[PDB]
Design a protein around this ligand. Structure first.
Ligand SMILES: *P(=O)(O)OCC(C)(C)[C@@H](O)C(N)=O
Lengths: 48, 55, 48
């Protein structure tokens, strides 16, 4: 999202765009939930 | 032949050899867990999660 | 006003956060006895 904003700004000052949509978006599914669990990045809910 | 229950030296050396994807020869027992991994905290956290569950 | 991105340094851990965004506060403080007239807006307007 912050990279998006940066790319967005520098696109406007370059004089390539006067307006820019800027943002970010991400979905939660089974397989990422699992892979973040194996990295031990996410809170283990049973400890919680 | 006689009966010997497994050494804690043989069993500790296998769960560090199996995790790092190496033979028993390639790993010295004198080397630390932090040395053998390199700079990967995820592999070092995953070896101390095996020995906490095992022993 | 500002938007920036920064890598960190040599390492062997992709998910470890770092300090490379400190470079947004990078300034030189060797010669810091007297004021910069460039910071004072009055000066900058007189020049314009
Ligand atoms: P290493 O020292 O790279 O640490 C990896 C972990 C998963 C601990 C870190 O990225 C985190 N999620 O806090």
């Amino acid at each position: 999202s912050v990279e998006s904003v940066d790319i967005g700004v520098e696109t406007i000052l370059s004089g390539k765009a006067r307006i820019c949509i800027v943002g970010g978006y991400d979905d939660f599914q089974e397989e990422g939930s699992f892979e973040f669990g194996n990295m031990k990045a996410t809170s283990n809910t049973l400890e919680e | 032949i006689a009966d010997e229950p497994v050494k804690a030296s043989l069993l500790l050396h296998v769960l560090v050899a199996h995790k790092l994807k190496k033979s028993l020869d390639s790993i010295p027992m004198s080397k630390t867990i932090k040395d053998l991994v390199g700079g990967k905290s995820t592999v070092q956290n995953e070896i101390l999660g095996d020995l906490g569950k095992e022993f | 006003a500002m938007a920036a991105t920064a890598t960190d340094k040599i390492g062997r851990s992709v998910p470890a956060p770092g300090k490379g965004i400190l470079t947004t506060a990078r300034e030189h403080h060797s010669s810091v006895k007297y004021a910069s007239p460039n910071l004072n807006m009055k000066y900058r307007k007189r020049q314009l």
